[PDB]
Chains A and B, each alone.
Chain A
Amino acid sequence: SGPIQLWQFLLELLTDKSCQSFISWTGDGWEFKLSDPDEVARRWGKRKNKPKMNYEKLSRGLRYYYDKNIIHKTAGKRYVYRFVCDLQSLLGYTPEELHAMLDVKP
């Protein structure tokens, strides 16, 4: 549980109400949208000591997850990605339950 990973950082953001303006759940299971990708990459960059971080590069992080049962793209939807890995075991809640607590307008 050392240096936090990209998928782990995004999950952290996804569970903070004060971050909903730039990253948020779409309301469909574990699908999520980087509504403001420049912001998300700026914070990821900050946490990992990488000033020059941008969405182009952060996205390559996301593409290395595609064969690894972590995160997939949602084809056709701008900035929309889906957790395919076992989040219900990780964070106790179902998606519907989490969406309720975090006031997700689907």
Chain B
Amino acid sequence: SNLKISRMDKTAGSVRGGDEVYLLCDKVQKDDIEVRFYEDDENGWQAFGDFSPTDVHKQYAIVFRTPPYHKMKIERPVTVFLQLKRKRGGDVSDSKQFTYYPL
């Protein structure tokens, strides 16, 4: 049923992507789960955490890699959101913060 991010390993990363995040969550199916990063402007940026079905641990955790931001040129730390999302299902989770850094 409903999707919950219980807690996360970390809530900040480099704008360049690649940061490894341990997300703890309620029951998920390895083959019907996606981690969507987003920004809710008219710009409407989205991206997906990079992981595989084997990185999904006993139905209750995901180990994944952050995607890049849409740009590296920022001089004050930016904040985007993220949610769990079923590929087939539409339904998503309560969306946690994530924060991108320069350099």
Contact = CB atoms under 8 A, between A and B. Distances in A.
Interface of A: 1-4, 8, 11-12, 15-17, 47, 49, 90-93, 97-98, 101
B47 A1 contact: yes
Contact of A12 (B68, B71, B73): B68
A99 B67 CA distance: 23
Given A91-B73, A92-B73, A15 B16 contact: yes
A13 to B, nearest CB: 9
7 closest residue pairs by CB, A with B: A92-B73, A91-B72, A92-B71, A1-B47, A15-B16, A1-B67, A1-B48
A16 B14 contact: yes
By DSSP majority rule, is chain B's interface helix, strand, loop, or mixed? loop
B26 to A, nearest CB: 23
Nearest to A4: B50
B92 to A, nearest CB: 17
A93 B72 contact: yes
Nearest to A49: B52
B16 A2 contact: no
19 contacts: A1-B67, A1-B68, A2-B50, A3-B52, A4-B50, A4-B65, A12-B17, A12-B68, A15-B72, A16-B14, A17-B103, A47-B18, A47-B65, A49-B52, A90-B71, A93-B72, A93-B73, A98-B72, A101-B103
Given A2-B48, A3-B50, A12 B18 contact: yes
